[PDB]
Specification:
This protein is mostly helical. The protein has a single domain, classed as Histone Acetyltransferase, Chain A (Up-down Bundle), CATH 1.20.920.10. The protein contains five helices and no strands. It is classed as dna binding protein.
């Protein structure tokens, strides 16, 4: 509360560490569905159904331009990518399976790096 603060958790490396995690996600062999924004002109249904599209290139641009206020808003965008994928793709599709695999990959890096 006013003039009463919990001890300061050191966030000075968070930008660098999120950038490293994102590089590892970018270079994963199953990242291909997620590298670029879904083309809203060429994929019927996507625009109407997926209210907040997100992809790795958009996260990378946001990360590089100071648009994440903290490491949690970064994780929310990463999870959005996989939540969108699960909304639109059958679990037993190449893209659906990619999204499950990547989510697992991310969440392990996240816990290992920060928790």
């Amino acid at each position: 509360s006013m003039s009463v603060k919990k001890p300061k958790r050191d966030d000075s490396k968070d930008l660098a560490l999120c950038s490293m995690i994102l590089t590892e996600m970018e270079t994963h062999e199953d990242a291909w569905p997620f590298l670029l924004p879904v083309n809203l002109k060429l994929v019927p249904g996507y625009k109407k159904v997926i209210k907040k599209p997100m992809d790795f290139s958009t996260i990378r641009e946001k990360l590089s331009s100071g648009q994440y206020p903290n490491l949690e808003t970064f994780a929310l965008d990463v999870r959005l990518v996989f939540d969108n994928c699960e909304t639109f793709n059958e679990d037993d599709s190449d893209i659906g399976r990619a999204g499950h695999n990547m989510r697992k990959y991310f969440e392990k890096k996240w816990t290992d790096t920060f928790k």
